[PDB]
Amino acid sequence: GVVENLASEQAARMVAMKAATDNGGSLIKELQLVYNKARQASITQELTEIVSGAA
Amino acid sequence: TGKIVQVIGAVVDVEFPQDAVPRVYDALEVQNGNERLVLEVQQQLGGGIVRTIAMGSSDGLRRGLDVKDLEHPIEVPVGKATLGRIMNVLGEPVDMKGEIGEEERWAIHRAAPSYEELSNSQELLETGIKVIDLMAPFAKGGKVGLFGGAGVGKTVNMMELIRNIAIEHSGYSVFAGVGERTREGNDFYHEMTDSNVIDKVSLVYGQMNEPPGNRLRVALTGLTMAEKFRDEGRDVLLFVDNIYRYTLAGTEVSALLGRMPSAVGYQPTLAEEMGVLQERITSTKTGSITSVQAVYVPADDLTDPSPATTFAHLDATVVLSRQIASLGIYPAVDPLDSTSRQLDPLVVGQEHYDTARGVQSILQRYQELKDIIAILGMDELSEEDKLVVARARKIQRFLSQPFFVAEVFTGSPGKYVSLKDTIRGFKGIMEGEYDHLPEQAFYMVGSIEEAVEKAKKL
Amino acid sequence: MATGKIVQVIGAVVDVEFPQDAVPRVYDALEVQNGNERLVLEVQQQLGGGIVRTIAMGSSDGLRRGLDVKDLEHPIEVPVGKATLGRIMNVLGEPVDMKGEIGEEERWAIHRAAPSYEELSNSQELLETGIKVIDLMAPFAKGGKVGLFGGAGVGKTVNMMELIRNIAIEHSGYSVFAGVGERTREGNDFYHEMTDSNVIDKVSLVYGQMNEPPGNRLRVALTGLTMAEKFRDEGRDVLLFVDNIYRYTLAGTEVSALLGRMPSAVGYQPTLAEEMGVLQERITSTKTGSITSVQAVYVPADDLTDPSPATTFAHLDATVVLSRQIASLGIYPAVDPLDSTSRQLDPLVVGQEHYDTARGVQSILQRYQELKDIIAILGMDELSEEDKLVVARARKIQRFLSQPFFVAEVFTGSPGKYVSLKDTIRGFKGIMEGEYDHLPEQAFYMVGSIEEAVEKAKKL
Amino acid sequence: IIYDDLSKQAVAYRQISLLLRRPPGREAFPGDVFYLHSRLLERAARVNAEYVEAFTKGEVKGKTGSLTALPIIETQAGDVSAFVP
Amino acid sequence: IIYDDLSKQAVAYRQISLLLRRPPGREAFPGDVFYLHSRLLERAARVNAEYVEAFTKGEVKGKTGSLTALPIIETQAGDVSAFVP
Ligand SMILES: Nc1ncnc2c1ncn2[C@@H]1O[C@H](COP(=O)(O)OP(=O)(O)OP(=O)(O)O)[C@@H](O)[C@H]1O
Numbered sequence A: 001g002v003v004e005n006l007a008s009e010q011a012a013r014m015v016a017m018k019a020a021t022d023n024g025g026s027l028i029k030e031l032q033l034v035y036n037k038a039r040q041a042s043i044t045q046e047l048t049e050i051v052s053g054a055a
Numbered sequence B: 001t002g003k004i005v006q007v008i009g010a011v012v013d014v015e016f017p018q019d020a021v022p023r024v025y026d027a028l029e030v031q032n033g034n035e036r037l038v039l040e041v042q043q044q045l046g047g048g049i050v051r052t053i054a055m056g057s058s059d060g061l062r063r064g065l066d067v068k069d070l071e072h073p074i075e076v077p078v079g080k081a082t083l084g085r086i087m088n089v090l091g092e093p094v095d096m097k098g099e100i101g102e103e104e105r106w107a108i109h110r111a112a113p114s115y116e117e118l119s120n121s122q123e124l125l126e127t128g129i130k131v132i133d134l135m136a137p138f139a140k141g142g143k144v145g146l147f148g149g150a151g152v153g154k155t156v157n158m159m160e161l162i163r164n165i166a167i168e169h170s171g172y173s174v175f176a177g178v179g180e181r182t183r184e185g186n187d188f189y190h191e192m193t194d195s196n197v198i199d200k201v202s203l204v205y206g207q208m209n210e211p212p213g214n215r216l217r218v219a220l221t222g223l224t225m226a227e228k229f230r231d232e233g234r235d236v237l238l239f240v241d242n243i244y245r246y247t248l249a250g251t252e253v254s255a256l257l258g259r260m261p262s263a264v265g266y267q268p269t270l271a272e273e274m275g276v277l278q279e280r281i282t283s284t285k286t287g288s289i290t291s292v293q294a295v296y297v298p299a300d301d302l303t304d305p306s307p308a309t310t311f312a313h314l315d316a317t318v319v320l321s322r323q324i325a326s327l328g329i330y331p332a333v334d335p336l337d338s339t340s341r342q343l344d345p346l347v348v349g350q351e352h353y354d355t356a357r358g359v360q361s362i363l364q365r366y367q368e369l370k371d372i373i374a375i376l377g378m379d380e381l382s383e384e385d386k387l388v389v390a391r392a393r394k395i396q397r398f399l400s401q402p403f404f405v406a407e408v409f410t411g412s413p414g415k416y417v418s419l420k421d422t423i424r425g426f427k428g429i430m431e432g433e434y435d436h437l438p439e440q441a442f443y444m445v446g447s448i449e450e451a452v453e454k455a456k457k458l
Numbered sequence C: 001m002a003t004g005k006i007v008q009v010i011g012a013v014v015d016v017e018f019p020q021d022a023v024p025r026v027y028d029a030l031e032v033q034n035g036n037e038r039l040v041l042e043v044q045q046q047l048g049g050g051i052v053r054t055i056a057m058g059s060s061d062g063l064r065r066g067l068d069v070k071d072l073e074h075p076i077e078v079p080v081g082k083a084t085l086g087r088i089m090n091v092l093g094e095p096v097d098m099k100g101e102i103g104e105e106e107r108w109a110i111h112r113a114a115p116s117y118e119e120l121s122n123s124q125e126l127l128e129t130g131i132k133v134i135d136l137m138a139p140f141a142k143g144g145k146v147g148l149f150g151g152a153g154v155g156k157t158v159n160m161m162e163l164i165r166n167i168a169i170e171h172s173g174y175s176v177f178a179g180v181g182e183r184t185r186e187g188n189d190f191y192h193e194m195t196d197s198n199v200i201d202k203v204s205l206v207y208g209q210m211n212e213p214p215g216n217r218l219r220v221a222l223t224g225l226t227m228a229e230k231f232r233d234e235g236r237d238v239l240l241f242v243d244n245i246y247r248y249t250l251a252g253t254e255v256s257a258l259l260g261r262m263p264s265a266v267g268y269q270p271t272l273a274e275e276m277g278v279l280q281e282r283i284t285s286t287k288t289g290s291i292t293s294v295q296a297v298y299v300p301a302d303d304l305t306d307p308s309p310a311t312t313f314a315h316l317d318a319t320v321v322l323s324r325q326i327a328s329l330g331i332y333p334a335v336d337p338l339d340s341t342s343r344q345l346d347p348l349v350v351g352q353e354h355y356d357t358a359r360g361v362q363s364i365l366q367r368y369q370e371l372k373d374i375i376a377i378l379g380m381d382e383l384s385e386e387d388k389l390v391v392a393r394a395r396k397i398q399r400f401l402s403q404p405f406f407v408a409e410v411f412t413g414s415p416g417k418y419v420s421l422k423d424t425i426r427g428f429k430g431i432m433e434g435e436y437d438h439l440p441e442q443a444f445y446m447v448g449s450i451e452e453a454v455e456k457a458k459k460l
Numbered sequence D, E: 001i002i003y004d005d006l007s008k009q010a011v012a013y014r015q016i017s018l019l020l021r022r023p024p025g026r027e028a029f030p031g032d033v034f035y036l037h038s039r040l041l042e043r044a045a046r047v048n049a050e051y052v053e054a055f056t057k058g059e060v061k062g063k064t065g066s067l068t069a070l071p072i073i074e075t076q077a078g079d080v081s082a083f084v085p
């Protein structure tokens, strides 16, 4: 019984780590949309202050 | 006696003789073909030039038109004769009924009441809505603001507040339509007339199709009527359909007035324009205005300068969010940002205060768990962290409620929940006396009873 | 006679017109009577015919149009040399300690060219601070520049005060302190500290405080540097302490906007790198004498990445970056070993003994930072035995980098410690090789010496 | 009525507005960009029979007209929280 | 002395500066906004008893005076990076 429960642990950790790896990759694809939107907005705002800063 | 000398968009410049130049905010008048156009003076430039905003369509103006100087501000019909009728920004009647039989007219530009004249009240106003007068209760004679992005329930919530407050309010009511869909205004007018409550409501509309000068000044026309009913000594309700449009119509004009842009391209005078309106919509020792204001937030960005400066002017702030509306939970109120000046142990009593802080403490702790739940899922939580998550999800669903104005959408019958009944429900969930019902039992139920009954139906 | 008139006043920027024959040169100085008070102006631009644009070296309040202005035909010149020791002066070199006139014999101009390429010197004489992390990770020369980089509230002023105690007392020579945009409270605290230490008679102080107008805050650094150049040209070895270089650049930004310069990135002036370079290049050691320099630099928001911290990094030989993370975690000094370094950390000079010890510490602490994130996911349960030794060494090394300062006994109650270079090498190599994990983690913390670290573990 | 890309109209108005040097706002559109799409779409309406009678001088009695509008907006990466959307 | 929202004071000074058409800076704040707060907060001091005797022309001897300041600033979503904070 002990040795079967140890093999059941390893198979349960395997499927848990699969789900964790997929949920991590799915969070990368959301943080990169937040980052790129903040990148573009920071360029637009700084260049508006520069162009509106002259004259 | 004066001539048009430049025409930029909605802004018109007029030249007058040096002895005859208009005061600021005086109203001018022009023949625009077969139409009459009113211009409001904004600035005096050098040399008898005066710069003005057109209160109507700017198309079809030539240079060199004769302008007539009416030597007074924009003045609007006021008082008991203004009641049950629809008006322009200029106070003209816009329903097909006849003349407004007004005895008095007031200028729409006024000073706020003196600091000596203000008055304070702790009297709770009760509402049908579980989350609002649990988390952000508000008082007779105070200001309420509904914040949200596009399409999240700002209007539906204000229309429920109109229904529920008018149950216990006897006096007159004013509705300022600033920059919202006309179709809404027509639906509301027919709702008011088909229920015969129209006899007590005064409506001012300057809807989003109208050019910038209308949208800027129509907010002030609405206040000027409510200030009359207040100075008659009554107590009054003022509902404002979207106050953001006032500051945006100021942005659309500002650059044409020749002003350097500020911050995210806003007018430099933004904080003064907002204050000079908001400070006259107040209660006083002679009478009281209770007001609900919708506040659109652009691009869901709660940190934009226009939302950010509006937060300081309000007593109760309710913050809607798209992420909760997307989960089906209506009203999509965020309990972790909605707040009130009135949520004090002394004002509401300890049991209410303690229940509200308990709900916030649990829901915040559930937010702290979402990152580990996202990466690893729930099985790696602690054995009482699983209990917090189970109570927090039940609390989230029990904040949801059926509305009588949402039967056109849900089809479900609506519910009114008394204060005593909601705090008892939330206290009981937090003590765990309901910890054996499923989550779905709490969705869209008026009172806890209805949740145990719904759990019997699964 | 006075030959020009004021034609505009817009904030701190005063425009003055002169006849087309006698227009003042750039950086010349002009004098006007503002009410009862004599005001100095400094010429920034010649623009159009006969007009010049100037900055007020004092309050602009109360100036009228049409006031007469006199052209003093020289730059601002300040008293230098032995008569300045023990005295506090402003940007104009007037006495603000209320002890009377300076009584100088010579006055020099605050604007001058840098030393020629041919005149520079190279020498690598190791100075010693007695501060573990600095002497390990960022050892100083003589004649080099030391940057202390940090955001608000991270220990720049405490570290500069401890460095003043350790270096100056042993220096046996003159020193200059420049307060650029410094808090008046801290300037009084330092002055009283120097007189109570009875060292004030070897130090000259120049103060331009935060409340002063932009012109004062801009030019004070050049006044203090001009005094240090006088002592250098006499052939001496001197310390120059500059209490924040950032507010020199920032005073230039406020000025630049109304000078009518077109803005640059992040709102900075176009000239930022030029203005910094014209200051930093004067601060060197020549064949005739040596200036040793310690500079604090404010990094806005801890960003470290905006133009003013970025430009200043190039000029310095020793760089100590103080981190909000370590300061917030409560370990002092807050010096980040992964971003702090000196060009004297060369195997040849420091000898292999010191170099291999330092690089060993640096390599462990980087390995710890990689493990530290996934440790939150894995605990230490799923980490390996190779990791468990490394983390144990890393944490105890990172405790042994802390030290109590004689300045900071006010904050801490514990006495200040001093630690010699050989001893701190012996202690870090002792955990590197001896690996005395016999001892609790707090036994390495705030003790100072290796012997006191074991004795603390012997006590607990 | 179908408007095949109101996002492309806003870009064209942004071009003309910026060539007239009008100070830009969020995402570089002018503040007039709300007023642009507002005055367009707010004409898609249904009108009562008294309006149709008064407009057509009584030639049509009791009917009610309507204009139904389906504007299209293209949005980047599905972001429903950008400005023009 | 407690200054409530010095952040509001800065916005009032920005309005004045842009209406006077002075050259704008970061976040459109005037460049000399640091000097606004700097010359206000540096009035909060403790002064030695010799300054108090010199000021009161000897009427008060041997007492130090003090002024303590507690300015309040509001940060939008906590960002210490903004220009006034
Ligand atoms: N309590 C509710 N129950 C069911 N559906 C709702 C509820 N509240 C809002 N909705 C749905 O979301 C829509 C958006 O809310 P609402 O009609 O108030 O527009 P809004 O959020 O005010 O946007 P706008 O500011 O443009 O008017 C509702 O029309 C309805 O479609």
Ligand SMILES: Nc1ncnc2c1ncn2[C@@H]1O[C@H](COP(=O)(O)OP(=O)(O)O)[C@@H](O)[C@H]1O
Binding pocket: C150, C151, C152, C153, C154, C155, C156, C157, C158, C159, C332, C333, C405, C408, C411, C412
């Ligand atoms: N070695 C130290 N010991 C104790 N406290 C310190 C030490 N270094 C800095 N601090 C703390 O930092 C703050 C002062 O740092 P300071 O250098 O004056 O700020 P800044 O670096 O912004 O000038 C105080 O909280 C002080 O206690």
Ligand SMILES: [Mg+2]
Binding pocket: B154, B155, B180, B242, B294
């Ligand atoms: Mg709405």
Ligand SMILES: [Mg+2]
Binding pocket: C156, C157
């Ligand atoms: Mg300091």
